[PDB]
PDB file of C-alpha atoms and ligand atoms in Angstrom:
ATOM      1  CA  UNK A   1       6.457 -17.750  -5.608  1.00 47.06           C
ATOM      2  CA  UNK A   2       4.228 -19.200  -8.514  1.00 46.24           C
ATOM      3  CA  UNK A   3       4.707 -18.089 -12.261  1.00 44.24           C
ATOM      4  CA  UNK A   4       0.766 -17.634 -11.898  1.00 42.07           C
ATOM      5  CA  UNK A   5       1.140 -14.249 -10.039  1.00 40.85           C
ATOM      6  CA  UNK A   6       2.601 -11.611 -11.489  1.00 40.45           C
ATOM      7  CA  UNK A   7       5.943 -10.009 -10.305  1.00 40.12           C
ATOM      8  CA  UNK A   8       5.160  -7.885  -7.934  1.00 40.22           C
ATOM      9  CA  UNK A   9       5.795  -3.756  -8.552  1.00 43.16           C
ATOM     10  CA  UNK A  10       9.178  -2.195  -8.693  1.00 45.30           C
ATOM     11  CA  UNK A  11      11.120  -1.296  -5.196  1.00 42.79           C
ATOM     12  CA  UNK A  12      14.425  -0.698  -6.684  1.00 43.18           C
ATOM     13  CA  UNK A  13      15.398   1.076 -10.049  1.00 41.81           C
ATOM     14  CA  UNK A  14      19.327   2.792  -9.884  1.00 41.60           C
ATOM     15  CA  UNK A  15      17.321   5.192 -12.845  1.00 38.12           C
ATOM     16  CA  UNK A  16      14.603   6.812 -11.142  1.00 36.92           C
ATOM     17  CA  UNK A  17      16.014  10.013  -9.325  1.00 33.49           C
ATOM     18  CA  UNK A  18      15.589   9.611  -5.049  1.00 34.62           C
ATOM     19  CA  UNK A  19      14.973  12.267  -2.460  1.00 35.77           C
ATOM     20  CA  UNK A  20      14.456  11.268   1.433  1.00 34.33           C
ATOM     21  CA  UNK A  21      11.746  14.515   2.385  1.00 37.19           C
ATOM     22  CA  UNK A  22      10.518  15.204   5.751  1.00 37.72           C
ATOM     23  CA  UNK A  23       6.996  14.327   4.788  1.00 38.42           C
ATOM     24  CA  UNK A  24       8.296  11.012   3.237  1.00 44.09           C
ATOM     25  CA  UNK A  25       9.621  10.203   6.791  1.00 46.84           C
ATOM     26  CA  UNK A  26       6.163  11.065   8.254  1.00 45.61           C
ATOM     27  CA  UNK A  27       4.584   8.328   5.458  1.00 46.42           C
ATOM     28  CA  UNK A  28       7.193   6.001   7.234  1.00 46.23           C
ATOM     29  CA  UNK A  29       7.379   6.825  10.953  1.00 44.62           C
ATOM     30  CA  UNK A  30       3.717   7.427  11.458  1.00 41.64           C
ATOM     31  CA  UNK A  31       1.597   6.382   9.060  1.00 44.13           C
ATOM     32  CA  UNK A  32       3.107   3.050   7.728  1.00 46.11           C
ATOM     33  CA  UNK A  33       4.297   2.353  11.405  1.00 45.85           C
ATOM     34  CA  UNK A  34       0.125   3.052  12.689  1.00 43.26           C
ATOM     35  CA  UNK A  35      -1.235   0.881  10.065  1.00 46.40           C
ATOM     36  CA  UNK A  36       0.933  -2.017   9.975  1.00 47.71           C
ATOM     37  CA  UNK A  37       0.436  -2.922  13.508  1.00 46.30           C
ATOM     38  CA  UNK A  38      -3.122  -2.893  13.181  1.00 48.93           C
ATOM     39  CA  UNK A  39      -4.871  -5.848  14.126  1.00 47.73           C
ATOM     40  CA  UNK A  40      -6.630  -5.828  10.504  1.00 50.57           C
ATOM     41  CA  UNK A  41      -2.916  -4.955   8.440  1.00 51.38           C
ATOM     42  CA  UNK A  42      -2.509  -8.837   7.902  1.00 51.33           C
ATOM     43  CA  UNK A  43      -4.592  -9.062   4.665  1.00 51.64           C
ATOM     44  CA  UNK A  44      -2.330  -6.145   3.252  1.00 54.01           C
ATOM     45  CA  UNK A  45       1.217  -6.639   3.889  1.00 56.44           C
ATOM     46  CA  UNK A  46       2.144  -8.020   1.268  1.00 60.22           C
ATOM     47  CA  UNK A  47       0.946  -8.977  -2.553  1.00 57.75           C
ATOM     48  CA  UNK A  48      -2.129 -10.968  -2.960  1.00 58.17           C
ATOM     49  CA  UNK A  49      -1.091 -14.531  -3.936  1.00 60.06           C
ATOM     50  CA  UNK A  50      -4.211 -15.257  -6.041  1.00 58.69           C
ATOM     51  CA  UNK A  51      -2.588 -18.966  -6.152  1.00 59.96           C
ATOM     52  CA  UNK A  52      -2.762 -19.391  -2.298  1.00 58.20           C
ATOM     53  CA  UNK A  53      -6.280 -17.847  -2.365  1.00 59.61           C
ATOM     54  CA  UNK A  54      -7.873 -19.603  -5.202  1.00 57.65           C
ATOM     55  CA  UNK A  55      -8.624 -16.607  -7.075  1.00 56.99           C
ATOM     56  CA  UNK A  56      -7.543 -17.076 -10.760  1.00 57.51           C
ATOM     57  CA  UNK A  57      -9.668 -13.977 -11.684  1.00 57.86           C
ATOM     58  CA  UNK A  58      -7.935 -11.042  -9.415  1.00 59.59           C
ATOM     59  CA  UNK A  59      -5.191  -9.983 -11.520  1.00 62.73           C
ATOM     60  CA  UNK A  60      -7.572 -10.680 -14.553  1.00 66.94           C
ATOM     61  CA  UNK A  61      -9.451  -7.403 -12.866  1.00 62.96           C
ATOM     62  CA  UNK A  62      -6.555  -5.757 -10.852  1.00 62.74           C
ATOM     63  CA  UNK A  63      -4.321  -4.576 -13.374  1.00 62.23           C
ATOM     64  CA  UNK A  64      -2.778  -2.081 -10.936  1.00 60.86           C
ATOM     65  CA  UNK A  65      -1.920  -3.908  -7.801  1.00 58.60           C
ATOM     66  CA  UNK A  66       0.153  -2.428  -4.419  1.00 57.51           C
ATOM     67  CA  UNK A  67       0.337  -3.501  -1.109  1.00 53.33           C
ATOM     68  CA  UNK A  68       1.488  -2.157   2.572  1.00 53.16           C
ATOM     69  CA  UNK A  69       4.682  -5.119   2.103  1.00 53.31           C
ATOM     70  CA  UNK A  70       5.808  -3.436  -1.135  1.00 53.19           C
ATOM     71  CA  UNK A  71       5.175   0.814   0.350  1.00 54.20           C
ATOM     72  CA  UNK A  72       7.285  -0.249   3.103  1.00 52.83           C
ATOM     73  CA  UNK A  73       9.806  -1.616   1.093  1.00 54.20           C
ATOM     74  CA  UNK A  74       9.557   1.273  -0.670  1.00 50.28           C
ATOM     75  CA  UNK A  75      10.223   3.960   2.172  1.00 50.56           C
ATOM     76  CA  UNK A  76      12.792   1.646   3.634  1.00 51.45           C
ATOM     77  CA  UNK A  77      14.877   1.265   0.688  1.00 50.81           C
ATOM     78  CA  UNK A  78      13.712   5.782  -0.701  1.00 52.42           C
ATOM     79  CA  UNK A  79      12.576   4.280  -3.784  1.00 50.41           C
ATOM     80  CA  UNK A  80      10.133   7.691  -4.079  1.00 48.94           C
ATOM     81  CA  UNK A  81      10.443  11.220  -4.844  1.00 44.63           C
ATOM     82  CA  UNK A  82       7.568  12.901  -3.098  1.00 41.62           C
ATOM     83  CA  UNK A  83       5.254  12.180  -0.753  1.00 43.80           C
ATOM     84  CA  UNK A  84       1.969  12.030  -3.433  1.00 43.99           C
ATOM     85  CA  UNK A  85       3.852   9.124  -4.973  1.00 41.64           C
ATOM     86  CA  UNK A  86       3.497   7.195  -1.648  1.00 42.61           C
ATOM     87  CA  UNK A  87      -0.040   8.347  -0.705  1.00 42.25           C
ATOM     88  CA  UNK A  88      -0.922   7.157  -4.321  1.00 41.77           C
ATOM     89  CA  UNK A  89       0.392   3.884  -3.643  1.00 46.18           C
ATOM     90  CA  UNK A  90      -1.623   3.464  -0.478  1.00 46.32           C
ATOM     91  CA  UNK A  91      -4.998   4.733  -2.239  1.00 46.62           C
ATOM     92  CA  UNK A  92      -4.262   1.897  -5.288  1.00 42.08           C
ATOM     93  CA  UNK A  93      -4.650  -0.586  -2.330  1.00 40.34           C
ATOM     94  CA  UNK A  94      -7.444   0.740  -0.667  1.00 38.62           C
ATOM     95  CA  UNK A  95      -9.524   0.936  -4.045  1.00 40.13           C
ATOM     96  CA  UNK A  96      -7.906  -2.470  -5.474  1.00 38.11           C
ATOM     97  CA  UNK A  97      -9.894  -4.058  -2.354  1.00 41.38           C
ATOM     98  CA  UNK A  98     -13.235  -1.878  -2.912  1.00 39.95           C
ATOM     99  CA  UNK A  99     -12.797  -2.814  -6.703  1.00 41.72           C
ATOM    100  CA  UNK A 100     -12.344  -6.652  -6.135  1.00 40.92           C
ATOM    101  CA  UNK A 101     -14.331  -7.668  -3.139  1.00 39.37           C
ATOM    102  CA  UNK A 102     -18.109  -7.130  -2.296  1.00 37.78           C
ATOM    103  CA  UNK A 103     -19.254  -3.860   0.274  1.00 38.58           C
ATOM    104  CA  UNK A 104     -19.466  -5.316   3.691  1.00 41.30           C
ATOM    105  CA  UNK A 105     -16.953  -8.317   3.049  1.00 42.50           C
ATOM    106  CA  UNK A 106     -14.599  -8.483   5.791  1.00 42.98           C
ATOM    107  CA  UNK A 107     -11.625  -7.886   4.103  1.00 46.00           C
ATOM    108  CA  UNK A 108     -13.520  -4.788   2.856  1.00 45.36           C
ATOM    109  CA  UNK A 109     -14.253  -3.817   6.328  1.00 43.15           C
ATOM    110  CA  UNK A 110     -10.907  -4.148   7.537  1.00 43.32           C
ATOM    111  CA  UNK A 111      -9.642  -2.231   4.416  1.00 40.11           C
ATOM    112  CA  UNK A 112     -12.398   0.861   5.656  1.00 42.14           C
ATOM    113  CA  UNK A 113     -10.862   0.517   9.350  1.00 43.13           C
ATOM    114  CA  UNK A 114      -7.121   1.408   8.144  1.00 42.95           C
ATOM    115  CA  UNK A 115      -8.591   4.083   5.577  1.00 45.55           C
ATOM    116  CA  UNK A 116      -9.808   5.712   8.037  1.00 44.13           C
ATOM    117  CA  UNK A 117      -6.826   5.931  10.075  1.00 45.56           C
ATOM    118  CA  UNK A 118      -5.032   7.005   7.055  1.00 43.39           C
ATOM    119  CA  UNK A 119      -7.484   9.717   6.420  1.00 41.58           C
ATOM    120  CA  UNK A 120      -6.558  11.415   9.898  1.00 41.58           C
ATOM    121  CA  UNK A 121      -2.614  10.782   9.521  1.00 41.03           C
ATOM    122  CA  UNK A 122      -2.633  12.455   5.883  1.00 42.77           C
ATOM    123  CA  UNK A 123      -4.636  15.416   7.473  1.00 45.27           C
ATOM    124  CA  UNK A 124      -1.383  15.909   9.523  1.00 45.31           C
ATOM    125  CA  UNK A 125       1.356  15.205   6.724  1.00 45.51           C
ATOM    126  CA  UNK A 126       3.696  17.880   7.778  1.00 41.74           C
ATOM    127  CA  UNK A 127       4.338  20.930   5.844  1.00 44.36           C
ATOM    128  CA  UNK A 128       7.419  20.063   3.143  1.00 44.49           C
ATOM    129  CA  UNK A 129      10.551  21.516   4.530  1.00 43.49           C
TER     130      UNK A 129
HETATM  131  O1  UU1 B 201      -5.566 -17.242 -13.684  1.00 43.06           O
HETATM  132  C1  UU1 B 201      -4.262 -16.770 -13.428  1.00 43.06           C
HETATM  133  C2  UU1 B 201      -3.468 -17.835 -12.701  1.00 43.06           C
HETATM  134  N1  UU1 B 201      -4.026 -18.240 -11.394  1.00 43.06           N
HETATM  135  C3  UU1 B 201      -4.580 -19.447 -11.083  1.00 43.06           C
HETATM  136  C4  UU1 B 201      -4.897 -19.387  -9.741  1.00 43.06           C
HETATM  137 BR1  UU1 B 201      -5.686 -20.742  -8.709  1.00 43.06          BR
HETATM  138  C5  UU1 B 201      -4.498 -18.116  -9.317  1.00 43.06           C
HETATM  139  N2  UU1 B 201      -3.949 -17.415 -10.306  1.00 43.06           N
END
């Protein structure tokens, strides 16, 4: 895409040490698979292209992006050790949205809708085996 985003965050690296864990295949098989078919998922599945928007200032204040595109690529292709690793990723892009946009925006909205179902699918993260 344009030099004027910035690469977007790792989802391969031979280095960093792998495990597949039960609750890892939870993040994928439920909770990933329940919010990306959401009818308000399309604003997060994938990087914000501050080009496309017309938003030169974004990554000026999100220094610490993530997106649903890039955790899926992430459980798909075990780039994580532990589970926290992935919920962390999914609570950067909730808060990158609170952050950037104004309460009661749309995009904010639909960013409250899938927290929500989060919330109740990380109440039930399995027990590590
Ligand atoms: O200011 C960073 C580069 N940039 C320009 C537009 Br439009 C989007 N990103």
């Amino acid at each position: 895409g344009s030099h004027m985003n910035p690469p977007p965050p790792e989802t391969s690296n031979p280095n960093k040490p792998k495990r597949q864990t039960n609750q890892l295949q939870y993040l994928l098989r439920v909770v990933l698979k329940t919010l990306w078919k959401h009818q308000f998922a399309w604003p997060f599945q994938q990087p914000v292209d501050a080009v496309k928007l017309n938003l030169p200032d974004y990554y000026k204040i999100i220094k610490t992006p993530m997106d649903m595109g890039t955790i899926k690529k992430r459980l798909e292709n075990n780039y994580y050790w532990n589970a926290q690793e992935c919920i962390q990723d999914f609570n950067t892009m909730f808060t990158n949205c609170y952050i950037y946009n104004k309460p009661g925006d749309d995009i904010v909205l639909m960013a409250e809708a899938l927290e929500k179902l989060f919330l109740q699918k990380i109440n039930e993260l399995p027990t590590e085996e």
